[PDB]
Design a protein around this ligand. Structure first.
Ligand code: NFU
Ligand code: SF4
Ligand code: SF4
Ligand code: SF4
Lengths: 114, 317, 143, 166, 374, 121
């Protein structure tokens, strides 16, 4: 698509970028203090690992990567699409057999005419 | 090939000097607009050094991506500098090289969200699912405009089609009377994209507001914070350079080995004039909005105008 | 242990104030020391939103029993060189609340304070005077 | 106005109705009730006039004759206005008293403070959980109680003078 | 469901509390409130101090409304023991309180403009507050927590220089109030961020006893400066306020009507201070002077009940004082703050709206916690 | 679509900053009867114990065998009730307000030190 040797320059500029960006930490670790390891998250400092005065944390989140609604007229059609397709896959053996039988008949009927 | 390394080092040092200085002038103007002396001009060159000074803190629940995403963010910005129009045609510009630009301008924000979300406490988990909704919501609005203008400047003749070095040959402003309307509809959609990419104004959502003022970057503390505050300023310069490249490139001819730097200064001045409206005025004049209202605006009053502009400009050729 | 590249934090301090049971008299003076009449951003101060960033804590209020671990918890998370400035006449031993079963007074017996500013409440010029005095102590401490 | 004293008087005998005026032209009516008549009067105030808001939920301690008092206010459609005051008492031998959180739905919020400060366990209110007193704190150590269980004497910290340490 | 707290130590807030919320991803399915972080034990210290020392422990109970707690306590002690107050003392009281509620409303107007972005409205209203700040510093003492009311009367009179010094800030604010009138009506941000959030019906506004501008915003006309004739308030003109006069004729109290009410009260106060400044006599201010014989009288006054009510800048507060003879100070003292039912009322008006609606809903009614968890 | 602050901001940029530089200029001047650091004298002190009755925030501790009293002013709240009840007038209010310090127990914040207490005796 692009060039003939052009996907080989991309690696060159990417590696020289990583060399500069890692050299900067290699400099800045020397001048200045070191590190340490604390844990509370700096996140609502009242509690880190406690039990009960009122209810508290540890109600962890699942995979919810949607917090928005466009025109709020597409989510209903998407759910009505996924519902039928989700409960098509029953799991009974005559479904398997009937599917391959009607596929064979479909290809035969088309190939006879044209 | 080795003459493509000297440019990638020297232009990097140039842009890393200039961008922070533009940020300092911006904070001075915003301070004078509300009766204040404000900080001195080269104020970010002290904040950068004191953030490199301190002691970095790693939480006890942290992956190998907590210490390695603010390297890959700066790496895919430095590697993006080689494909951008600095006024002269870029160094590695071949027949493709628009989708490489869109891909690497998308990919830095995903590294930022993966670096924030790969930590412990769930302030980062809520401050990341708000990030990627706004990332998905603002990049069908620029793809239509840029693909329509790159297709339309290829009718009258060029040898490297769909490439950013082809955007200095012929512009929008010589297609006749109907293109003068697509010019202002396209000025609208590009100013809206430029305000929503660097995230200031209405769209100041995932930066200094996690339920009050916690932010997305509530956790990075030492060197890492200094590197992220540098990388976002370089990206601020890059996106506005794209906006002034598409809209009006009017450079001098001036042959010689020193017309390059004169055209470089003229492009830097046009970058300053385009930031001065958008970032400064639109930050001073309007507060935040929301997240559920920032999504239904980019699919209704920005993406619609891109379709109107692209269709009307298609009916000019 | 303080090594060398820290003269710059004397020209760019970032603050973060820790309320522990005040009556909101000095919190106005923290906020009103940044409005256009008593302006402070020209030194470089900048109200930050998390204790990972800041390097000057700005503790007010008498230490109320319920907020006693929180003050000892937010002291680790601020990184190195940092100071502590106690503002008012109730980190310095209570004012009218020295005789309660709930307020364990002066803030020195909890964490190592550096500069005290008396008054009830102090005028905002006294806070600027206090931060200048503490910052020149830490400039002395570098050399 | 000044006629509500007579209206509560002629309806409910064996109660202590009195009117007090003090020094700038303001009058307040005071009444002291037994138990069952207290619940019936809190029923009767809500039917005497459509919904009237009430201010405070004071409890206190007079010895082994614990009390409770309220400041219901009504007829505020005109700038004269009127405001009544009720109080009831209870023995320490049986610290119970009927709740009124069916008529005025905010009295639970003063009742929780009443439980946790000074004794006085009410009727089966829907919530008996405490508020603004810490959980890492002893049980029967009622702070505003006068002399029975004043908290200890020995957890009163002073943060004393510098002259007394030299 | 995810369980996250709100945090005692935040950015944005000036007081520590815990508002625990159960959030369904982005909505709110339940919110409850716990408090007790400012619990300094105010009744317990106040149980063993004498009468004079509680007059100063009462005004440091909160910072913004520091004149109201100093006012109603004196009203309660005078209603208990029985002490007359002259005319000049009452005129100075209604000058000082009505002058300080402007200070209480402008910083509220600035803080609500801070949580929706908008640093500009913050810096400009907090620049406009400084004339009232210099007036109060000139007449009394320090800027906040100023004390000038004793058991007898006031502690210093204004004279004639302060008349000149006060009659200029009125003229200064008459050129400022139309600008914040005109910005507030039509903005692209204010009407898109604080409209149609936390709607409060009149049934729950009456049955949970909401008091201040949270009450009369949705519509219930009542005011303790009006509903009881107090002081010199009836014969200088006093009315309640309604968002119908400021903003057309709407009545849907959500957040926007409350800001309309807080601007209408500034428009009332600029005239109620103006007319009351020339209608004063000369006389005495300090019923028994030279406050030495007052400390030789604490053994004698007592034996009664007492209750006092007044209009705070955020609602209507009330104190109760019971004392007994042969003693030094009181026997029982209890204050009630106006943001107790307003904090218990909004917890049901937050019936599943948003996540970023939370700060702009909570900071809408002045969550001055320092009087809540006393 | 509606941006009403814009003429205000454009007019506002072409004016003076309207601020007060503190480490170059005198600060904002105080009024006349301004509250400050309480100043104390020893020579006029009859020891009538009236100050300890009226002080809401205990800075005063009476001591017998010489009829004086000490104080620690770092806990004062500036409420004047010791000034207007003292008969002998050895307590005045000053105009100082710049009181930052390093230690709680300085020499400026305490009066009538115990060595001077034995020097009186
Ligand atoms: N307004 C007000 Fe306060 Ni800080 C409350 N609640 C005290 O009156
Ligand atoms: S230091 Fe004084 S003014 Fe400040 S909160 Fe405490 S009592 Fe109030
Ligand atoms: S100041 Fe007054 S009360 Fe105090 S010891 Fe001296 S004379 Fe006595
Ligand atoms: S102002 Fe007066 S009463 Fe208050 S601490 Fe100072 S000397 Fe004592």
């Amino acid at each position: 698509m692009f060039g003939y040797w052009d996907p080989l320059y991309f690696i060159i500029v990417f590696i020289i970028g990583l060399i500069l960006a890692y050299l900067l930490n290699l400099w800045a670790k020397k001048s200045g203090m070191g590190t340490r390891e604390v844990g509370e998250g700096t996140k609502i400092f009242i509690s880190g690992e406690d039990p009960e005065k009122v209810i508290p944390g540890f109600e962890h989140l699942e995979g919810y990567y949607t917090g928005r609604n466009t025109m709020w007229g597409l989510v209903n059609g998407v759910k009505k699409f996924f519902a039928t397709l989700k409960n098509d896959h029953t799991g009974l053996l005559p479904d398997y057999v009937s599917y391959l039988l009607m596929t064979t008949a479909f290809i035969l009927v088309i190939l006879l005419l044209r | 090939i080795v003459y493509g390394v000297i440019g990638l080092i020297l232009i990097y040092i140039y842009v890393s000097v200039v961008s922070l200085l533009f940020s300092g002038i911006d904070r001075k103007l915003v301070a004078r607009m509300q009766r204040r002396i404000g900080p001195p001009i080269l104020q970010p060159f002290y904040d950068f050094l004191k953030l490199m000074s301190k002691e970095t803190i790693i939480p006890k629940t942290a992956n190998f991506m907590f210490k390695a995403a603010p390297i890959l963010m700066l790496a895919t910005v430095i590697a993006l500098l080689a494909y951008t129009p600095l006024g002269f045609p870029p160094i590695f510009g071949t027949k493709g090289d628009i989708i490489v630009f869109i891909y690497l301008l998308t990919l830095a924000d995903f590294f930022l969200v993966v670096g924030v979300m790969s930590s412990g406490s769930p302030y980062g988990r809520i401050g990341a699912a708000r990030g990627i909704a706004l990332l998905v919501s603002r990049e069908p609005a620029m793809m239509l405009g840029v693909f329509a203008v790159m297709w339309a400047i290829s009718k009258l003749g060029v040898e490297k089609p769909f490439s950013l070095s082809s955007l200095y040959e012929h512009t929008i402003w010589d297609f006749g009377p109907v293109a003068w309307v697509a010019g202002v509809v396209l000025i609208y959609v590009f100013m809206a994209w430029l305000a929503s990419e660097i995230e200031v104004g209405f769209f100041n959502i995932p930066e200094a507001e996690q339920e009050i003022a916690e932010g997305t970057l509530v956790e990075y503390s030492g060197r890492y914070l200094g590197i992220i505050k540098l990388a976002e300023s370089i990206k601020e310069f890059i996106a506005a350079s794209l906006v002034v490249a598409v809209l009006f490139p009017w450079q001098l001819n001036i042959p010689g080995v020193q017309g390059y730097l004169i055209n470089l200064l003229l492009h830097t001045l046009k970058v300053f004039i385009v930031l001065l409206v958008s970032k400064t005025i639109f930050r001073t004049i309007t507060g935040r909005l929301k997240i559920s209202q920032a999504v239904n605006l980019l699919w209704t009053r920005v993406f619609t105008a891109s379709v109107i502009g692209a269709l009307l400009l298609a009916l000019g050729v | 242990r303080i090594a060398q590249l820290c003269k710059f934090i004397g020209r760019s301090p970032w603050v973060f104030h820790v309320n522990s049971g005040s009556c909101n008299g000095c919190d106005i003076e923290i906020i009103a020391a940044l409005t256009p009449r008593y302006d402070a951003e020209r030194f470089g101060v900048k109200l930050v939103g998390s204790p990972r960033h800041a390097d000057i804590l700005l503790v007010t209020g008498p230490v109320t029993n319920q907020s006693l671990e929180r003050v000892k918890l937010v002291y680790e998370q601020t990184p190195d060189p940092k100071i502590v400035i106690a503002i008012g006449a109730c980190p310095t031993g209570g004012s009218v609340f020295y005789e309660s079963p709930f307020t364990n007074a002066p803030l020195d017996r909890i964490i190592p304070v550096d500069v005290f500013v008396p008054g009830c409440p102090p005028r905002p010029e006294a806070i600027l005077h206090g931060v200048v005095l503490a910052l020149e102590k830490l400039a002395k401490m570098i050399k | 106005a000044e006629m509500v004293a007579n209206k509560i008087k002629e309806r409910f005998p064996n109660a202590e109705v009195v009117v007090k005026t003090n020094k700038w032209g303001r009058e307040r009516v005071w009444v002291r009730i037994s138990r069952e008549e207290y619940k019936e009067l809190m029923k009767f105030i809500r039917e005497l006039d459509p919904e009237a808001h009430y201010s405070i939920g004071i409890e206190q301690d007079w010895g082994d004759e614990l009390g409770f008092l309220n400041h219901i206010l009504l007829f505020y459609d005109e700038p004269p206005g009127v405001s009544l005051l009720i109080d009831v008492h209870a023995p320490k031998d049986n610290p119970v008293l009927p709740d009124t959180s069916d008529i005025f739905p905010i009295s639970l919020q003063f009742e929780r403070e009443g439980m946790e400060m000074v004794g006085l366990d009410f009727e089966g209110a829907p919530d008996k959980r405490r508020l603004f007193l810490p959980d890492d704190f002893p049980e029967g150590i009622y702070p505003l109680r006068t002399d029975e269980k004043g908290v200890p004497e020995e957890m009163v910290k002073n943060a004393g003078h510098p002259y007394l340490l030299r | 469901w995810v369980k996250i707290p709100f945090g005692p130590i935040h950015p944005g807030l000036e007081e520590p509390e815990k508002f625990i919320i159960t959030l369904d991803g982005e909505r709110i399915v339940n919110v409850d409130v716990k408090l007790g972080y400012n619990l300094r034990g105010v009744q317990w210290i106040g149980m063993r101090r004498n009468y004079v020392q509680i007059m100063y422990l009462a005004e440091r109970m909160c910072g913004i409304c520091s004149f109201s707690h100093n006012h109603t306590y004196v009203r309660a002690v005078e209603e208990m023991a029985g002490i007359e107050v002259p005319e000049r003392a009452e005129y100075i009281r209604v000058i000082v309180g009505e002058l300080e509620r402007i200070h209480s409303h402008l910083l509220n107007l600035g803080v609500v403009g801070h949580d929706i972005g908008y640093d500009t409205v913050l810096h400009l209203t907090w620049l406009a507050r400084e004339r009232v700040m210099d007036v109060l510093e000139a007449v009394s003492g320090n800027r906040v927590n100023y004390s000038m009311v004793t058991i007898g009367g006031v502690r210093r009179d204004i004279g004639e220089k302060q008349k000149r010094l006060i009659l200029d800030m009125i003229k200064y604010y008459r050129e400022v109030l139309p600008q914040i009138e005109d910005v507030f009506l039509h903005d692209s941000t204010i009407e898109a961020r604080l409209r149609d959030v936390a709607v409060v019906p009149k049934k729950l506004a009456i049955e949970m006893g909401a008091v201040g501008p949270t009450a009369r915003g949705s519509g219930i006309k009542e005011d303790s400066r009006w509903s009881e004739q107090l002081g010199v308030y009836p014969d200088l003109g006093i009315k309640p306020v309604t968002p119908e006069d400021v903003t057309g004729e709407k009545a849907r109290g959500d957040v926007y009507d409350r800001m309309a009410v807080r601007i209408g009260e500034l428009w009332m106060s600029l005239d109620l201070l103006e007319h009351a400044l020339d209608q004063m006599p000369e006389g005495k201010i300090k019923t028994f002077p030279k406050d030495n014989i007052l400390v030789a009288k604490l053994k004698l006054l007592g034996d009664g009940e007492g209750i006092g009510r007044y209009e705070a800048p955020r609602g209507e507060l009330v104190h109760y004082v019971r004392g007994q003879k042969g003693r030094d100070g009181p026997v029982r003292w209890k204050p009630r703050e106006p943001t107790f039912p307003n904090l218990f009322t909004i917890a049901k008006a937050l019936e599943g709206n948003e996540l970023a609606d939370l700060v702009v809903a909570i900071a809408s009614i002045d969550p001055c916690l320092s009087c809540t968890d006393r | 679509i509606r941006l009403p602050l814009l003429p205000t901001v454009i007019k506002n940029l072409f004016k003076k900053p309207a601020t007060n530089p503190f480490p170059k200029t005198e600060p904002v001047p105080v009024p006349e009867d301004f509250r400050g650091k309480l100043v104390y004298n020893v020579d006029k002190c009859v020891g009538c114990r009236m100050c300890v009755t009226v002080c809401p925030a205990g800075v005063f501790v009476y001591l017998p065998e010489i009829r004086k009293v000490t104080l620690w002013i770092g806990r004062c709240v500036m409420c004047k009730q010791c000034v207007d009840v003292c008969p002998t007038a050895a307590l005045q209010m000053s105009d100082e307000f710049l009181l930052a310090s390093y230690d709680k127990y300085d020499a400026k914040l305490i009066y009538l030190t115990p060595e001077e207490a034995e020097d009186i005796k």
